[PDB]
Amino acid sequence: LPQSVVGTGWTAKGQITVLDMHPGSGKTHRVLPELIRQCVERRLRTLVLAPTRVVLREMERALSGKNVRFHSGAIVDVMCHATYVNRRLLPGRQNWEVAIMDEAHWTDPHSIAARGHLYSLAKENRCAFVLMTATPPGKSEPFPESNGAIASEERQIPDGEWRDGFDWITEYEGRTAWFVPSIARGGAIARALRQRGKSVICLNSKTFDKEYSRVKDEKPDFVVTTDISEMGANLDVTRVIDGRTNIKPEEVDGRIELTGTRRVTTASAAQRRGRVGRQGGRTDEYIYSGQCDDDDSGLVQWKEAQILLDNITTARGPVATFYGPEQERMTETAGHYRLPEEKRKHFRHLLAQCDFTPWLAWHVAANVASVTDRSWTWEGPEENAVDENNGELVTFRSPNGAERTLRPVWRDARMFREGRDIREFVSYASGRR
């Protein structure tokens, strides 16, 4: 066990420790159960935050016991990063002595807000904070350690259908993990592989919970994933194909656009490369193309993190900041995005019940009059009109039978990414939910 968590010094109120362990070391196998044990013996009420629901259930079948309680009494409470944020949004007011966050390097807005609130409470000597990442925020090294040898070579990677020139992709007995910047490009890569006689399973933010099990049972030749596999995913592959690209939303002229690709950060590229090299006695491959880019300040994920964090803090209490090496990404002074309590209830309803983004939920709950108003979805500018991939305008009918055209006043392209996101937003705009 690492010396930072030997003894009892890591549980002292105000202590902040970072556990850099390359994958395959025993973070969830030997370290985390030992950290839980020391806190149960001392009656220290603890909080354990898991990144994904898949990570939560894997820790559930191993740590469920007498004094452990899994969410969405006991001493240890375990929940997701978003669960801690959403429950804290309801004035729902519990405290803890020690906090442990697994995979605390996620740039998801809820993960950034959870880091900020726990870091701020630890600065007030109200709790202790432990962070567990192979790529801690601030460190920039694209080739970290691993249990097995990893051969990194740069070669051109196709972003779509290829005729010839890439025979190294098919001529390889073994299982490969291919990272793509978006779902749309992942479907095109699956077309070229399946046409050439290869088994493919696609993993994205909307298919990860249902088909993560099929990777173990079906043993596919390729796994086309969209960065959802960076956060605690055991794909059991020996080769990683990574173009180091990523499609992330930005704010441009009061609108969230999803156009173009950006270079991934060093932590993301190292996290993709960490999918292999987890067992010695063999050599895995990591195929990349291009360099990295650690300047992701232009992404809207940093603004939405402060929107959540400013509405997370307790009333008549100290404001909260981001985590240490991350406060350079703060858009405004701490506490700027604070909303009134009545406006906050509408903000919480849009996130949990309507599946809005933190960006869109903030602008709606802070500028509309009634909570049952739907006019803002068809009263916006003509420029904000929404269309499908066939060119047809999105049309829905209000309860009075009037066919409307979707022109939101606050346009967020993430809400119109696919029919799965369109029909849920159309169902809201039409008044069905």
Side-chain angles (χ1 to χ4, degrees), residues 40-63 65-327:
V40 175
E41 308 307 89
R42 292 177 49 86
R43 297 117 170 263
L44 289 182
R45 337 181 78 166
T46 56
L47 174 68
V48 180
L49 300 185
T52 64
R53 288 179 288 261
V54 179
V55 171
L56 186 60
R57 74 194 189 191
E58 297 180 89
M59 306 188 312
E60 190 176 17
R61 68 173 62 96
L63 303 177
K66 179 210 306 177
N67 255 329
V68 188
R69 177 186 176 185
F70 289 82
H71 298 69
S72 187
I75 284 298
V76 187
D77 291 333
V78 193
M79 63 185 65
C80 285
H81 296 187
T83 297
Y84 171 80
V85 163
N86 290 268
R87 195 219 68 176
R88 197 70 172 84
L89 205 62
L90 173 60
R93 182 66 178 93
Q94 276 70 21
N95 301 325
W96 285 280
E97 319 290 341
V98 186
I100 307 178
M101 183 178 301
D102 176 61
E103 304 286 352
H105 69 270
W106 205 9
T107 52
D108 178 78
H110 290 70
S111 298
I112 307 172
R115 280 196 299 270
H117 194 242
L118 291 181
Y119 170 82
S120 305
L121 292 176
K123 289 284 106 176
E124 302 294 331
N125 291 263
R126 282 174 45 85
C127 69
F129 195 17
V130 176
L131 300 86
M132 311 182 67
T133 50
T135 57
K139 302 177 60 181
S140 298
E141 190 164 355
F143 309 102
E145 279 193 356
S146 59
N147 293 335
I150 300 180
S152 300
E153 285 107 46
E154 178 180 2
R155 65 186 68 171
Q156 183 182 358
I157 301 176
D159 60 331
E161 177 71 40
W162 70 91
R163 297 183 179 182
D164 62 328
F166 300 91
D167 295 331
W168 58 270
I169 306 180
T170 58
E171 294 181 347
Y172 179 83
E173 170 59 78
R175 310 210 285 276
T176 308
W178 193 333
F179 280 88
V180 291
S182 61
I183 300 178
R185 295 187 182 180
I189 298 301
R191 274 291 187 175
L193 297 177
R194 290 169 182 167
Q195 176 64 24
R196 290 174 168 85
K198 288 296 183 298
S199 302
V200 177
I201 296 184
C202 297
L203 298 181
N204 47 84
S205 59
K206 293 164 161 154
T207 63
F208 191 82
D209 295 335
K210 282 193 175 185
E211 295 193 0
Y212 181 76
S213 53
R214 274 178 76 240
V215 184
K216 196 189 76 174
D217 318 310
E218 301 198 345
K219 197 229 295 181
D221 306 330
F222 291 92
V223 180
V224 182
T225 172
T226 76
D227 290 353
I228 193 61
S229 299
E230 291 183 5
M231 309 304 304
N234 306 326
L235 304 183
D236 200 328
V237 291
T238 57
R239 189 177 65 169
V240 170
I241 297 181
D242 176 24
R244 293 181 172 180
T245 55
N246 199 188
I247 297 191
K248 283 287 169 292
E250 310 181 283
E251 180 180 3
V252 175
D253 299 330
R255 291 136 48 101
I256 303 302
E257 67 167 14
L258 262 186
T259 65
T261 63
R262 72 175 307 275
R263 309 300 299 181
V264 304
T265 65
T266 299
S268 297
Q271 200 65 215
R272 296 182 184 181
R273 187 183 165 269
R275 302 306 97 183
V276 292
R278 303 197 177 190
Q279 285 182 319
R282 65 180 181 182
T283 56
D284 298 338
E285 301 193 62
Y286 173 77
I287 279 77
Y288 65 98
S289 63
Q291 304 301 329
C292 303
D293 196 337
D294 293 1
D295 187 7
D296 53 352
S297 58
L299 306 187
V300 80
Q301 60 188 20
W302 306 108
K303 183 177 182 178
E304 309 188 87
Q306 193 172 356
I307 293 180
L308 300 168
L309 182 61
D310 287 355
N311 293 282
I312 271 177
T313 63
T314 317
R316 203 60 210 95
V319 294
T321 71
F322 284 178
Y323 180 49
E326 292 179 332
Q327 53 202 12

Side-chain angles (χ1 to χ4, degrees), residues 333-352:
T333 305
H336 179 265
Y337 299 92
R338 183 75 170 183
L339 294 179
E341 215 294 315
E342 272 297 327
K343 307 292 185 176
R344 209 182 315 171
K345 180 174 298 182
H346 190 202
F347 175 78
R348 186 169 185 259
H349 178 82
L350 297 174
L351 290 183

